[PDB]
């Protein structure tokens, strides 16, 4: 009837500017593997060399997607959503922020579907609109025929057997695998992300917290209570409950002016030197190590989850409202009170079971073990007992 609002392929480049830091795009991808619909048990971040080209790999063993839902994924604004995703843009901004081209393999226990979000493909054919090739799969193919030809002719996978074997890189029968190539290179010529300095870490070519340049430490605190396992370059990331790993822990509260829900704030001391305020939102870290009050008070960390706020388009900050300024003022005042109240090893030690993903409180020390199971506890010794009261 009426002509639709088209979208230029340049928009894929434009949208990539949503994230000012690449760890935020990577966080977008991890947030998509952890949301309750998918609820992946494990995600794998790695760098793989394909066709003499560096590729970022994000492989989760989650629910998987249908060919229809994969198109919805590669489309804008489509989301069936305390999940983290709200916009229906996270992947389209994050993957493009990481590289020019992205492939998404997904299997949901019966269908093998491939999707391509590549600006290189769109610029080679000089398309005027955004074209997204998608192919579903016995492994017999199922509309998808020109998509498969475009993928074989313009992506990094030229042979059909290699394209299908990429599904075997999912550690289960259901899961998703994102593969981003043509990564962002900064002005000095090198790649923005560092793969060679630390074989078990992805760094940034940079006082400044180690979370700002170390992807391992960033993933360690990306979530307020981790439930999903993260493997950075085949090595498990020892995540932590940033609130429970503090010493001399005291508590405070904050009431938003537009509701009657008390929000708990946890104040403590860091055990390894760096510090500030951890502002979360639906378990996701939005603002990290924000100095408030007498910190501009060394070593004190305050944890707060602000579900009464709403993050920005990139989930790196919040909307600048009266509630936000009031929350920061309150945090500064209460942190000053906490530090005034005081004039090592954490008060509690918590470990996540490797097979079980629950957090158990141990009477021990804190770094933390790589693999640990409920069966190894000192009494809660079985993986069938739920978490503690917390
Ligand atoms: N790794 C994944 N595994 C399974 N399903 C996924 C995955 N990534 C995306 N999806 C699905 O595809 C949709 C695309 O989401 P996306 O465009 O990234 O934004 P969103 O997750 O909907 N919310 P937002 O991140 O704020 O934009 C998701 O809502 C899921 O339904
Ligand atoms: Mg998303
Ligand atoms: Zn367990």
Author numbering: 29 to 109, 116 to 171, 175 to 179, 183 to 246, 260 to 326, 329 to 351, 358 to 404, 420 to 442, ...
Question: What do the study's own words say?
Answer:
Members of the MORC family are characterized by their gyrase, Hsp90, histidine kinase, and MutL (GHKL)-type ATPase domain, which is also present in several chromatin-modifying enzymes. The ATPase domain of MORCs is followed by a CW-type zinc finger and one or more coiled-coil regions. We show that MORC4 is an ATPase with an intrinsic DNA-dependent but histone-independent enzymatic activity.
To gain mechanistic insight into the MORC4 activation process, we crystallized ATPaseCW (aa 29–486 of human MORC4) in complex with the non-hydrolyzable ATP analog, adenylyl-imidodiphosphate (AMPPNP), collected and analyzed X-ray crystallographic data, and refined the structure to 2.9 Å resolution. The ATPase module folds into the GHKL-type domain, consisting of a mixture of α-helices and β-strands, and is involved in the formation of a large dimer interface, which was also observed in the respective structures of MORC3 and MORC214,15,17. Each CW domain interacts mainly with the loops between α8 and β10 of the ATPase domain. The residues P279, K289, and K297 of the ATPase domain form a number of polar and electrostatic contacts with the Q424, W426, Q428, D430, W435, and A449 residues of the CW domain. Strikingly, while the MORC4 ATPaseCW cassette structure superimposes well with the structure of ATPaseCW in the homologous protein MORC315 (RMSD of 1.5 Å) and shares high sequence similarity with MORC3, the mechanisms of action of the two proteins differ. The ATPaseCW cassette of MORC4 is capable of binding to DNA and therefore is active, whereas the ATPaseCW cassette of MORC3 represents an autoinhibited state, which does not inherently bind DNA. Furthermore, the R225/K227/K314 cluster is formed by R225 and K227 from one protomer and K314 from another protomer in the dimeric structure of ATPaseCW, suggesting that dimerization might be important for the association with DNA.
